[PDB]
Design a protein around this ligand. Structure first.
Ligand code: K
Length: 381
């Protein structure tokens, strides 16, 4: 029931997460407030939380919902700056296609809130939406309301950046290509039927991003269980667009019960890809199990592609665990030659793309093993 969202419980849960996100960012970077946060809104998650990440967006821009009598959220108002107790933070609101499919009315609500923030008569140092929208209105020669466009998604009918697909298929040379794919697919703006492409305004707003942010429940679907999270990650994109080339700080709120993306990748890697409990658990399935391990390594590479969030030691440990250990290598090779070949390919690709630095010895062995499994695959075929 899309008008039910967000509930007073979701509003209250969301305040805690946003205060924690801003506290970490200020404490780390010279007590500087971030100007703009790029964040993803997943539709399934907004069902389950009665609109927690929705409410996080409203909190950031200093808006509160207004349930009528039938518990419908039809309107917003601004929190006054003395109540907010900090600047209005600008937000690039990257809605999933599914969020768009289910919550067009709530995409309209966010939009009203941000335009409201933009038009407010308040000092620019306490209203980063207003500060940006005026600069943006001036640069591009448009209205302030037009300039205060922040609610973006896929084209009507479409899903995903297809950065996941690029990584899974190894069908790309430079990061610019992944970044071009994202900007070409995610630049469709909500406005008062049709998502209008607005690429130049999407790029302009993206260049103002200081922080990237997503909510995830690592207990249910971790950062590396699926490709959809790195698919939606604009961390390296923002660096590549910005005049100053500054990569924004990246965070993940884990809703299991706020970390840097780096911290979250390290936790997931030691819990899943590098953890004996996990990979032995997968190999118990046999043929499918080796596929799951290969998939994990590909999704980890995805985070290298979008964020450079994977420490070299993660790839060195994965190589030591699955390739250098002759016993484990033989089990992979014997159970699933096809997924073993993919894993060997993925280790060589990671070196090829500069995401993994390793010894000549390790690479020679990977090439040697690449030859041997192909020779075996063609053996039966
Ligand atoms: K999507």
């Amino acid at each position: 029931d899309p008008q039910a969202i967000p509930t007073a419980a979701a509003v209250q849960s969301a305040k805690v997460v946003v205060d924690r996100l801003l506290a970490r960012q200020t404490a780390e970077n010279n007590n500087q407030w971030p100007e703009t946060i790029a964040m993803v809104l997943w539709g399934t998650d907004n069902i389950k939380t009665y609109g927690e990440s929705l409410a996080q967006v409203l909190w950031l821009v200093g808006a509160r919902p207004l349930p009528d009598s039938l518990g419908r959220v039809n309107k917003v108002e601004l929190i006054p700056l003395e109540e907010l107790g900090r600047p209005r933070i600008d937000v690039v609101v990257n809605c999933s296609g599914v969020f768009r499919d289910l919550f067009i009315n709530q995409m309209a609500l966010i939009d009203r809130a941000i335009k409201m923030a933009a038009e407010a008569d308040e000092p620019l140092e306490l209203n980063f939406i207003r500060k940006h929208a005026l600069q943006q209105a001036s640069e591009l020669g448009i209205d302030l309301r037009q300039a205060a466009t922040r609610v973006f998604t896929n084209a009507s009918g479409s899903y995903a950046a297809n950065v996941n697909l690029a990584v899974e298929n190894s069908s790309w040379e430079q990061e610019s290509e992944l970044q071009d794919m994202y900007l070409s697919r995610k630049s469709f703006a909500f406005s008062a039927g049709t998502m209008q492409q607005a690429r130049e305004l999407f790029e302009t707003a993206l260049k103002t991003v200081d922080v990237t942010f997503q909510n995830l429940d690592s207990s249910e679907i971790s950062l590396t269980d699926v490709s959809h999270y790195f698919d939606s990650d604009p961390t390296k994109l923002v660096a590549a667009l910005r005049g100053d080339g500054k990569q924004p700080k990246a965070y993940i709120a884990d809703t299991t019960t706020v970390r840097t993306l780096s911290e979250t990748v390290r936790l997931d890697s030691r819990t899943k890809l590098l953890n004996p409990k996990w990979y032995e658990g997968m190999l118990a399935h046999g043929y499918e199990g080796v596929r799951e391990i290969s998939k994990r390594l590909v999704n980890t590479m995805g985070w290298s592609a979008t964020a450079g969030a994977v420490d070299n030691w993660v790839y060195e440990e994965a190589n030591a665990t699955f390739i250098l250990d002759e016993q484990m290598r033989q089990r992979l090779l014997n159970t699933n030659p096809h997924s073993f070949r993919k894993m060997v390919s993925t280790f060589l690709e990671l070196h090829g793309r500069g995401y993994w630095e390793t010894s000549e010895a390790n690479l020679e062995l990977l090439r040697q093993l690449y030859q041997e499994v192909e020779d075996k695959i063609e053996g039966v075929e």
